[PDB]
Amino acid sequence: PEKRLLTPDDMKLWEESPTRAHFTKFIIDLAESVKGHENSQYKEPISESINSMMNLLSQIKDITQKHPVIKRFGKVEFRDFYDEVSRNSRKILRSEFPSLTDEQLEQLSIYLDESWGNKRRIDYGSGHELNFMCLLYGLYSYGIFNLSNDSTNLVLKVFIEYLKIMRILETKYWLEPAGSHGVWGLDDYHFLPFLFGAFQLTTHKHLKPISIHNNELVEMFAHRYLYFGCIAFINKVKSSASLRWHSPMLDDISGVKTWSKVAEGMIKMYKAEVLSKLPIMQHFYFSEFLPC
């Protein structure tokens, strides 16, 4: 028994709520944990839960390679993919997290299932990346993750790995952008990369938001800074066409004096344009670890 429940000023009962406050806080703790760290500055002895989390991602990674495009917009084999995760997620989690009761698995599995896109629409958006985080927040809130010893590693090992998988799905199956931000959404599929990415560069004595226009910087830090990775990805797609053509929020953001002001904007923006969009939020699952 856990599901979604939202409409018109159910949403007013959303910002006010202590869940929003708890969860919002969590994602910030994660953003700042990572506040001056390149993609591979992990915090020391990589805590054992983090490994298990990574080797559950590899299992998912594996499951995509069992499903080849054998047959425009949206490639149906993805539903074959989704169907696999949908029917193993309980089995998968139990294997990597033997601590977890029958009943907690019930609460987690659903999020794992919806982390990767829609079976019916063959698409992905902010809501899906958000589900993942909800999962990750659930693990944490069941004692599977220690905020101090993990935090940084949740972002650098777990989320970046996740993003790597999305990038394979996205390319392999031609997942449609969930496109439920107007025209001033950052990117076809993703938000949090930019968010975290910006925490990463707050501290940099040399990259400036204007930098994402400089192609040599972009490929030099592609695999080293989330935010540049994304830009590098974008640059494939909109070959030798300017960035505005592709995404004028991004274009506008690059005009901001510092990474530091950018990151703050990015939080106001997430608070406002993800966690208060009826369209997104009414597809977000409440659960015992996320009440309402």
Coordinates of C-alpha atoms in Angstrom, one line a residue, residues 3-240:
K3 CA 0.9 5.3 -4.2
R4 CA 0.3 9.0 -5.3
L5 CA -2.4 11.4 -4.0
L6 CA -2.4 15.0 -5.5
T7 CA -4.4 18.0 -7.0
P8 CA -5.2 21.8 -7.0
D9 CA -4.4 23.0 -3.5
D10 CA -3.5 19.6 -2.1
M11 CA -0.4 21.4 -3.4
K12 CA -0.8 24.2 -0.9
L13 CA -0.9 21.4 1.7
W14 CA 2.5 20.4 0.1
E15 CA 5.0 23.3 0.8
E16 CA 3.6 23.8 4.3
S17 CA 4.0 20.1 5.1
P18 CA 6.8 18.7 7.2
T19 CA 7.7 16.1 4.5
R20 CA 8.7 18.7 1.8
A21 CA 10.8 20.4 4.6
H22 CA 12.5 17.0 5.6
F23 CA 13.1 15.9 2.0
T24 CA 14.1 19.4 0.7
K25 CA 16.6 19.5 3.5
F26 CA 18.0 16.1 2.6
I27 CA 18.8 17.1 -1.0
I28 CA 20.5 20.3 0.2
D29 CA 22.7 18.3 2.6
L30 CA 23.7 16.3 -0.4
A31 CA 24.2 19.4 -2.4
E32 CA 26.6 21.0 0.1
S33 CA 28.3 17.8 1.0
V34 CA 29.7 18.0 -2.5
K35 CA 30.4 21.8 -2.2
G36 CA 33.9 21.8 -3.6
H37 CA 34.5 18.3 -5.0
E38 CA 35.4 17.1 -8.5
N39 CA 33.5 14.1 -9.8
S40 CA 36.0 11.7 -8.3
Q41 CA 36.8 13.3 -4.9
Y42 CA 35.2 10.5 -2.8
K43 CA 35.2 10.8 1.1
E44 CA 37.6 8.1 2.5
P45 CA 37.0 4.4 3.3
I46 CA 34.1 4.1 0.7
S47 CA 31.4 3.0 3.2
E48 CA 30.1 -0.4 2.7
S49 CA 26.5 0.6 1.9
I50 CA 27.8 2.7 -0.9
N51 CA 29.4 -0.3 -2.6
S52 CA 26.2 -2.4 -2.4
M53 CA 24.4 0.6 -3.9
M54 CA 26.9 0.7 -6.8
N55 CA 26.7 -3.0 -7.3
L56 CA 22.9 -2.8 -7.5
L57 CA 23.3 -0.1 -10.2
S58 CA 25.6 -2.4 -12.1
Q59 CA 22.8 -5.0 -12.0
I60 CA 20.5 -2.5 -13.6
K61 CA 23.3 -1.5 -16.0
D62 CA 23.4 -5.2 -16.9
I63 CA 19.7 -5.5 -17.5
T64 CA 19.8 -2.8 -20.3
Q65 CA 22.3 -4.8 -22.2
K66 CA 19.9 -7.7 -22.3
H67 CA 17.5 -5.7 -24.3
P68 CA 18.6 -4.6 -27.7
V69 CA 16.9 -2.4 -30.2
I70 CA 15.6 -5.2 -32.6
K71 CA 12.9 -3.2 -34.5
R72 CA 11.8 8.8 -35.1
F73 CA 10.8 9.0 -31.4
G74 CA 10.7 6.3 -28.6
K75 CA 11.9 2.7 -29.1
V76 CA 9.6 0.2 -27.5
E77 CA 12.1 -2.3 -26.4
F78 CA 12.4 0.1 -23.4
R79 CA 9.2 -1.4 -22.0
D80 CA 10.9 -4.8 -22.1
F81 CA 13.7 -3.1 -20.1
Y82 CA 11.3 -1.5 -17.6
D83 CA 9.4 -4.8 -17.3
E84 CA 12.6 -6.4 -16.2
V85 CA 13.3 -3.9 -13.5
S86 CA 9.6 -3.9 -12.4
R87 CA 9.8 -7.6 -11.7
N88 CA 13.2 -7.9 -10.1
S89 CA 13.5 -4.7 -8.0
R90 CA 12.3 -6.6 -4.9
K91 CA 14.8 -9.4 -5.7
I92 CA 17.6 -6.9 -6.5
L93 CA 17.4 -4.7 -3.4
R94 CA 17.0 -7.8 -1.1
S95 CA 20.3 -9.0 -2.5
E96 CA 22.3 -5.8 -1.9
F97 CA 20.5 -4.9 1.4
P98 CA 20.0 -8.1 3.4
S99 CA 19.2 -5.9 6.4
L100 CA 15.8 -4.9 4.9
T101 CA 12.6 -6.5 6.0
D102 CA 9.9 -7.9 3.7
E103 CA 7.8 -4.7 4.4
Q104 CA 10.5 -2.1 3.7
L105 CA 11.1 -3.7 0.4
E106 CA 7.5 -3.0 -0.3
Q107 CA 8.1 0.7 0.3
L108 CA 11.3 0.9 -1.6
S109 CA 10.7 -1.2 -4.7
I110 CA 8.1 1.1 -6.2
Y111 CA 10.6 4.0 -6.4
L112 CA 13.3 1.8 -7.9
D113 CA 10.7 0.8 -10.5
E114 CA 9.9 4.4 -11.6
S115 CA 13.4 5.7 -11.6
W116 CA 14.0 5.1 -15.3
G117 CA 11.1 6.5 -17.2
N118 CA 7.5 5.8 -18.2
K119 CA 6.6 2.3 -19.6
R120 CA 3.7 3.7 -21.6
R121 CA 5.1 7.0 -22.9
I122 CA 8.6 5.8 -23.3
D123 CA 9.9 9.0 -21.7
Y124 CA 11.9 10.5 -18.8
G125 CA 11.9 13.7 -16.9
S126 CA 12.5 15.5 -13.6
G127 CA 9.9 13.3 -11.9
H128 CA 12.0 10.2 -12.7
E129 CA 15.3 11.5 -11.5
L130 CA 13.3 12.6 -8.4
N131 CA 11.9 9.2 -7.8
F132 CA 15.5 7.9 -7.7
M133 CA 16.3 10.5 -5.0
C134 CA 13.1 9.5 -3.1
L135 CA 14.5 5.9 -3.2
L136 CA 17.9 7.1 -2.0
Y137 CA 16.1 9.1 0.7
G138 CA 14.2 6.0 1.7
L139 CA 17.4 3.8 2.1
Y140 CA 18.8 6.6 4.2
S141 CA 15.8 7.0 6.4
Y142 CA 15.8 3.2 7.0
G143 CA 19.3 3.4 8.4
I144 CA 21.0 2.1 5.2
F145 CA 23.0 5.4 4.8
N146 CA 24.9 7.5 7.3
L147 CA 24.6 11.2 6.3
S148 CA 28.1 12.3 7.5
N149 CA 30.0 9.2 6.2
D150 CA 28.0 9.0 3.1
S151 CA 26.6 12.3 1.8
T152 CA 29.4 13.1 -0.5
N153 CA 29.6 9.6 -1.8
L154 CA 25.8 9.4 -2.4
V155 CA 26.3 12.1 -5.0
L156 CA 29.7 11.2 -6.4
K157 CA 29.4 7.4 -6.6
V158 CA 25.7 6.6 -6.5
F159 CA 24.1 9.5 -8.4
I160 CA 26.8 9.9 -11.1
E161 CA 26.6 6.2 -11.8
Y162 CA 22.8 6.5 -12.1
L163 CA 23.3 9.4 -14.6
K164 CA 25.7 7.2 -16.6
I165 CA 22.9 4.6 -16.8
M166 CA 20.3 7.2 -17.8
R167 CA 22.7 8.4 -20.5
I168 CA 22.7 4.8 -21.9
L169 CA 19.0 4.4 -21.7
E170 CA 18.4 7.9 -23.2
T171 CA 20.6 7.1 -26.2
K172 CA 19.9 3.4 -26.6
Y173 CA 16.0 3.8 -26.6
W174 CA 15.5 7.4 -27.7
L175 CA 13.6 8.3 -24.6
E176 CA 11.4 11.3 -25.1
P177 CA 11.9 14.4 -22.9
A178 CA 9.2 14.4 -20.3
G179 CA 9.0 18.1 -21.4
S180 CA 6.7 19.1 -18.5
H181 CA 8.7 22.4 -17.9
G182 CA 7.8 25.2 -20.4
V183 CA 10.7 26.3 -22.7
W184 CA 12.8 27.5 -19.8
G185 CA 13.6 24.1 -18.4
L186 CA 17.3 23.5 -18.4
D187 CA 17.6 20.3 -20.4
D188 CA 15.6 17.6 -22.1
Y189 CA 15.9 15.1 -19.3
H190 CA 17.8 16.3 -16.3
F191 CA 17.8 18.9 -13.5
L192 CA 19.8 17.7 -10.5
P193 CA 23.1 17.3 -12.4
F194 CA 23.0 21.1 -12.9
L195 CA 22.0 21.6 -9.2
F196 CA 24.8 19.4 -7.7
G197 CA 27.2 20.4 -10.6
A198 CA 26.9 24.0 -9.4
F199 CA 27.7 23.1 -5.8
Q200 CA 30.7 21.4 -7.2
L201 CA 32.1 24.6 -8.7
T202 CA 31.3 27.2 -6.0
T203 CA 34.8 27.2 -4.9
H204 CA 36.7 27.4 -8.2
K205 CA 39.3 30.0 -8.6
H206 CA 39.1 29.7 -12.4
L207 CA 35.9 28.2 -14.1
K208 CA 33.1 30.9 -14.2
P209 CA 29.5 30.2 -15.5
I210 CA 30.5 31.9 -18.9
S211 CA 32.9 29.0 -19.2
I212 CA 30.4 26.5 -20.5
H213 CA 30.7 28.4 -23.9
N214 CA 34.4 27.5 -24.2
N215 CA 34.6 24.1 -25.9
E216 CA 38.1 23.3 -24.8
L217 CA 37.1 23.8 -21.1
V218 CA 34.0 21.7 -21.8
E219 CA 35.8 18.6 -23.0
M220 CA 38.6 19.1 -20.4
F221 CA 36.3 19.0 -17.5
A222 CA 33.4 16.8 -19.0
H223 CA 34.1 13.8 -16.8
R224 CA 35.3 15.9 -13.9
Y225 CA 32.5 18.3 -13.3
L226 CA 28.9 17.3 -13.5
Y227 CA 27.9 20.6 -15.0
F228 CA 30.4 20.4 -17.8
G229 CA 29.5 16.8 -18.5
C230 CA 26.0 17.9 -19.2
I231 CA 27.1 20.7 -21.5
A232 CA 29.4 18.2 -23.2
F233 CA 26.4 16.0 -23.8
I234 CA 24.4 18.9 -25.1
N235 CA 27.2 19.9 -27.4
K236 CA 26.9 16.5 -29.3
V237 CA 23.2 17.0 -30.2
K238 CA 23.3 20.8 -31.2
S239 CA 26.5 20.5 -33.2
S240 CA 28.2 23.9 -33.9

